[PDB]
Amino acid sequence: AGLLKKTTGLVGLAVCETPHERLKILYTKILDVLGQIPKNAAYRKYTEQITNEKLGMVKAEPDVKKLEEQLQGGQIEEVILQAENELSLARKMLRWKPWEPLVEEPPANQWKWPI
Amino acid sequence: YIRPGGVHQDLPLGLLDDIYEFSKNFSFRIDELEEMLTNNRIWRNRTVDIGVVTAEDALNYGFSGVMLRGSGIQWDLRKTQPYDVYDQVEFDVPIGSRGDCYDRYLCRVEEMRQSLRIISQCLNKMPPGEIKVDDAKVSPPKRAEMKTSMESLIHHFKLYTEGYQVPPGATYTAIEAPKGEFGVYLVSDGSSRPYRCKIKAPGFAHLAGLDKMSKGHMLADVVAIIGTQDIVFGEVDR
Amino acid sequence: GTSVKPIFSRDMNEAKRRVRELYRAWYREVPNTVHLFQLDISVKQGRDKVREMFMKNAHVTDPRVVDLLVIKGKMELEETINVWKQRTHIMRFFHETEAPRPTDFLSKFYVGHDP
Amino acid sequence: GVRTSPTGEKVTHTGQAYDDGDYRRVRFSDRQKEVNENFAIDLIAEQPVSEVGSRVISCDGGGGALGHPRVYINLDKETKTGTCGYCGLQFRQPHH
Amino acid sequence: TYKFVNMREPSMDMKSVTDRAAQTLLWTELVRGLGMTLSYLFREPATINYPFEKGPLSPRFRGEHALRRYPSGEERCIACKLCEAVCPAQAITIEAEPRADGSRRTTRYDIDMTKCIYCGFCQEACPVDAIVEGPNFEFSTETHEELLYNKEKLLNNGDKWEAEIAANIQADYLYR
Amino acid sequence: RKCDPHIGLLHRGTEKLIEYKTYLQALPYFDRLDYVSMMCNEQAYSLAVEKLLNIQPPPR
Amino acid sequence: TQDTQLIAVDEKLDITTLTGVPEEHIKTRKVRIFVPARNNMQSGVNNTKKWKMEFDTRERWENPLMGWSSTADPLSNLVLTFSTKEDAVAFAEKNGWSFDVEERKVPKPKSKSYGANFSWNKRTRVSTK
Amino acid sequence: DTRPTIRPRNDVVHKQLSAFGQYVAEILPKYVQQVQVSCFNELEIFIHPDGVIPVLTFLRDHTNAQFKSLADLTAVDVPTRQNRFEIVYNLLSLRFNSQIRVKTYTDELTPIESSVTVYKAANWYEREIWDMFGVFFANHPDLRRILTGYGFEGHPFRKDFPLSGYVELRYDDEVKRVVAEPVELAQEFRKFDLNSPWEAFPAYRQPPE
Amino acid sequence: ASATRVIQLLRNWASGRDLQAKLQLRYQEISKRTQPPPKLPVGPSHKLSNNYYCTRDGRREAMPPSIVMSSQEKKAVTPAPPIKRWELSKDQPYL
Amino acid sequence: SNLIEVFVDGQSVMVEPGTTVLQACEKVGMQIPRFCYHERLSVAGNCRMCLVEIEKAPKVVAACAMPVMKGWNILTNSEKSKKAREGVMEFLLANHPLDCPICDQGGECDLQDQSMMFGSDRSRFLEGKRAVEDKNIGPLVKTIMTRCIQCTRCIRFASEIAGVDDLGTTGRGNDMQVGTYIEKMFMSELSGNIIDICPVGALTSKPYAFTARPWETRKTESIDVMDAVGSNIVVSTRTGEVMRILPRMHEDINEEWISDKTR
C-alpha cells in the first residue's frame, strides 16, 4: 500500500500512518452532515457528488500512491486536511444556509462601472 | 525603463557581452558568499529553527514568494502562471524543507544561482525585432518618424500630453517579485488616468505575520526573523 | 430607506451612554498623560480641552454617527495611553503656533477676500 | 548684447529687470544675478537670408533627426521673407 | 521543476561521525571562513580614487538639465509645453509670449530641481531636443534656493555642457 | 510576547498620487516603491496596463 | 427585507463630523453642481455627460521667489464627477456643503436640410459652396 | 501571426471561469447578486455585504474552490453611488491555479464583518481600509490607524479629500517642538483637464438616459 | 592597480579555488565604450499597404465584461483542472 | 404621426422625417466624426469624414447631408465605415504642416483628437507637402493658412452669421486657398468667432496667441458684462491670470457666439 513517507514536505502537516480509514470516516461524516441539508440546496447535490466519487474512490484503491495520483489532490495528508475543511464548511453552511433567495437586490447603479 | 507596451529603447550595442562577462564569474561570487555562512556553526545557530512557520499558517497569513517556497509549499508564479516569455526558460524553484530562517536563506541563495541559468537562456535566445508595440496609439513613435510624418507627430503630441485612454475595466496582475507576489489592482474609467491603483505589497502580509513568527523567540532573534522577512520599507508603507 | 442597521447603539440613549464613560476614560488619565509626556500645560487646561472637544461634537443626532466618534475617540485614548503620540501630537490639539483668526466681518475685509 | 538698467542691473533677454523701489533685490547683493549673454533674439538676426529658386522649401534645422520637425515654408510673398517657426532661419526667392 | 535545498541526511558510519566530531572540536568551517577572509585580504581592492578617478557612465546618463540651442544660435525651445505636460512631478513651469521678432519662445522656463525626479521624460517629449539632462551630476549646493533653476541658469548650462551634450545625443539619437 | 510593528513612517501618498497622473506619468512611482526590485515592479504595472489595453509587447 | 436590528434613522446623513474637514472649509465654501460645457474650440461632446462638483476659487498670490501661483485653499483642485444631478446634489449636504445647481443645457435639435442651400424663393440660398 | 500586437485571448479559460461562475452562483444564491468574466479572463463575484463571511468561507474551504490565499483587500471610492465605498477581495487558489474577485458595497456608516476569522491576512488589510477610507469593520481585533500619522483627521483616499491635505508640518522654534499648521503650498498643484471630448471606445458607450 | 605568483598561490590556496581565471575586476574583456552606430529594425506594421489600423487595433476589441448570471445532472465544476504535481529537478535534485 | 423609424446600429430610433443621418446617430449617443458640419451653419459636404455605411447599401453615404427614411440601419462602427474614416483622415493629414508644437490648436485640435480615435497610427505619404502664403485679415485673427483643411466653416460663418461676404475660396484643385483675395480686414462684431469654428489652428486669436495650453487652463463659467445681452462665457484662468474668454452655449441668449468686445 506504499511505504510510510518520512515527511510530507509541508511544515506542520504530519504524516498520517493510517490515511485510508481517516478518509473513509470523514467522508461518511460528510454525507452525514449533508443529510441535514434538504435536497433543494445546490450545495447538497454538488458536495454529495464530489464526496460520493471520492468515497467510492478511496475504498477501491488500497494503495496510497495510486490513491494520491488518481485523487489529484497532492499528498494524501492534504486530502484529509481538505476533507476536514469540507466538514467544517458544511457544518457552518447549515447556520448561514444560502439556499434562500437573495436577501436584497442591490441599488440600481451600485454595479455598472463606467462612471 | 519597462513601460506598457515593451521598453523605452533598445539595448546599447555591446551590452550583452558585458552581461555575459559579469554572469561568467558570478557563480564564484555566490560561492564566496555561501561558503562562509552555510556551514558556519555560528550562522546556522543564529537562523536554524528560528521563525519557523507551518504550511497552512503561511497560506492563511497571506505569505507569498519565498515564504511559501521556504516552507514546503511548491508555488511560484514564474511556473504556475507564466507571464512574458517565462514559459520558455527552464529553471528550478528551490523548495525549502524546515521553513525556518536558515531554509529560506538557502532558498534565496539558490534562487540567486537559478537566475543565472535564466540569464544564460535569455542571453543565448534574445530575438531580433522592435522593443515597443508597433502601435503609435499606445507607444510613442520613433524620434526619426516624429520629425518626418504627420501622424507620428500628432500621436507623439497626444501621447505625451494626454496619454493613451485605456478601456474601462479592473484588473489584478501579479508577478513573482524577488520578495513575493507584487501585484496591482488597477481600476480604469475610460479616461487617460487611473481611477484606483491598489498596490499588492508582498511585505504587508509578511510583516503582518511578524508577531506570529516572533512568538517565544528571544529578542535578539527578532532581527533574524525580519531579515528573512525581506521587508523593504517603501512597499509596506507604499 | 429610513431604516439602516446600526454600529453599536440602537438609539441615542445608549449612544449617549457610550459617550459618558468615554469622557470618563478621558477625564482620569489627563493628569497622568500630562505627567507622562512632560506637558508644559497644566492639568486644568487639559481637562476642559477634553471637555471642549466633546462639546463641539454636540449637534450630532444620529446613533450610527455617535458610535463612529465614540470608537474614534477610543483609539485617540488608546494612542495617548500607550505613548503612541508624542508631545507634538498632543500639543496639536492646543493650536498654539497659529495666530488667532479674527471673527468680525471688518477684520476679514481688512485682511483678504476670505468669505 | 546685454543692456544695464538705470538702477545698475543687467536686463535679461526676456526684458526682466527689478525696479529701483523693488524690495526683491537684496537677494542679488553679495551674489550675482544670473543672466545669459548669448541673446537668441540677437544671434538669429546675423544668420544670412538663404536664397533658393523654388516656390516652397523644406527646413529641418540641419542634422536630420537632430533638428526640428520638417516644415515647408511658402516663399511666395516677395514683400518679405519666410522664416521657419521652429528655428527662425529665413528664406527668400531671388526675384522669384 | 523543483529542487530540495535542504534534505541531506548525514551518514552514521564511524568515519562520518568522527569527521563531524573533528569539525566540532577542531573548528574547521570556522577556519574555512577565516581562511577565505585571508584570501580577500591579498586581493585587489576595487576602490576608485575619487575625485581623481570618476566612475564610469553611459551616454544615456540623466543629470543636470540644460536647454540647448541650434547651431545658428537661436534656442531650440519653442514653448510647446510638452515637457511641462508630461513631467511626473510637475517640476516644470513654463510661460510663453510673442517675441519682438516674431517666432516666440519662453519668457519663464523654471525647473524645480528639488522637485525633479530625473526621469528623463522631458527630453523624450521635447520634439526639438531643447530640454535635455546633461552629464553633470556634481551640482550639489549649500542652499535650497540655488537648486530652483530658472531659464537663465538652465540656458547657462546649455552654453556650458554643450560640448558634451552634443556628443551624447550624437551617439544615442539612433537608438531613440 | 507580542511584536506590534508600527508602520506608516514612510507613508508617501503613492496610491492617491497615482490617480492624479496619467498611466505613463505613474510609471516612475513603481520604481520608487521597492528600492531594489525596479524592473520587476514596472513589469507588474506594465502587464496590468497591457492587459487592460488588450495589447502585447514584441518578442524582443 | 433585512432583519439586522433595524432602527429608524430618518434624520439626514451628517457624516461631516467624520470627514475631518476643518470648520472653515465646511460652511464658507459654496460648491457648484454643473454639467461642463463643451470646449468651444473643439466640437466633440464626450466631456458634457457627467455632472461635476467644484469649489469656489480663492486667493492665489505670487511667491516672493521666482513667483509661482501660491495658494492656501486645499479645496482648490478638488473636482468630483457624478452621473446624475440627484446623486451630486445629495453628496453636497451629506458632506455639509452649501451648493448651487445649474441644470444641464441640452443643445436643442435643429432641422437641417441640404436642399435649402439652393432655394428658389427663400433667402437661405447660399452664394458660395 | 495576424495579431502581432493584439494580446492573444484564451477561450478555454473563459469557459472554465464562466462554468465556475455559474457553479458559485447556484451554490449561494443568498448573496451572489451578479457574476461576470472580464475579457481578459478574470472572474468577479458581486455579493451582498451580509455575505462577506459566508461567501469567503465557502471559497476558502470547498473542495472544488480551495481559494486559500487573500492576495489583497482594497476598496474603490465612488461618490456617485449611494454606497460610495466598494470593498474588493482578491483570492488565489493554489490547488486549482486560479484567482477570484469578490466585491461588496458599503456606505459611510455601515460596519462590515471583518474577514479576520476566515483569512488572518485580512487583519492588517482591514486597518488600511478603515484608515484610508473610513469603513469600520465589526469584530476586528485591533482596528486602528495603520498608515496615517497619529491624530490624523479625515480619511485620505476618499475622493473628497484634497490631495495636498489640510495640514502641513513645521518645526516652530518658539515652542521648540514640531507643530502643525494649515497648508500653504509654495506652488499650487496645476490640475490638468486632459480628457478628450471625443468618444474613445464605442464598446463601452453607456446608453443615454 | 595581476599580482606576484607567490601571492597568487597563497591567495588561491586560502580561498580553495583558482581565482585568477574568474576575477571580480574587469580589466579588458569589457566592450569598448565607443561602439559603432546601430541600425534599429522596424515593427511588423511598418508596411506601405494592407496595414489598416482597423485590423490591428488592440484597444477597440475589448468588449465589456460578459455577465453569466444576474439576479435581475450538472457536474460540479472546478475553476480550472488541478495542477499536475511538480517533479524533482534533473540537473541537481538534492542540493 | 410623421415620425419615421430608423435603426442606429440596430437599435430602433424615432426620428422626425427630414432628419439627417448624423442627428439620428446622435440620438443614440454616437457622435459621427465631422469637420465641415457645424450645427449652426449650413451643411456643405466638404468634410467627407461624416461618411458612414448604411446596411445593405454598397455606397457609403455622407451622414452630414443624407436624410433618413424608413428602415435604415446606420452601421456606424462597420468595417467599411472605419476604412473610410482612415482613408479620409489620411488625405487630411497628407499635406498638413508639422506645427503641432507651435500651433495654438494643440491640445484642443479636432484634427489631433480625431486622429487619435478615428485614424491610422502612421503615414505612407513619402512626398513633399504643400505650403501656402499667409494672409492678413486684421490684428485680431491669427492666420496660418498652411494648416487649413478647406472645411469652409469660416466661409459659411461669414456669409450666414456675420452677413459680410469677404471670405471665400480662390482657385481649384489642391492649390485652392480660402481667404479674401484682395487684402482686406475681415472686421465685424462677430469676427472673433471664426477662431472657434475653425477646427484647426489655421485661424487663431492673435492677442492670446501662444501664451497658454488648453490642458493647463482652468475653465470658469461666467456672464459677460460688456454688453446688455449678458452672453454666457467661459473664462479660462491659469495661475491666477485671465487668458481667454470663450463663449458658452445657451441656445437662447448668445447661441454659441460672443462679440469681439466680449472676447
Ligand code: SF4
Ligand atoms: S526629468 Fe525632471 S524635469 Fe524632466 S520630466 Fe522628469 S521630473 Fe520633470
Ligand code: SF4
Ligand atoms: S518640450 Fe522642449 S520645446 Fe516643448 S516647451 Fe519643453 S523645452 Fe520647449
Ligand code: SF4
Ligand atoms: S491645427 Fe491641429 S494638427 Fe495642425 S498643427 Fe495645430 S494642433 Fe497640429
Ligand code: SF4
Ligand atoms: S480657415 Fe479654418 S474655417 Fe476656414 S476653411 Fe480653413 S480650416 Fe475651415
Ligand code: FES
Ligand atoms: S460632416 Fe458631412 S462631409 Fe464633413
Ligand SMILES: [K+]
Ligand atoms: K481654431
Ligand SMILES: [Zn+2]
Ligand atoms: Zn527651421
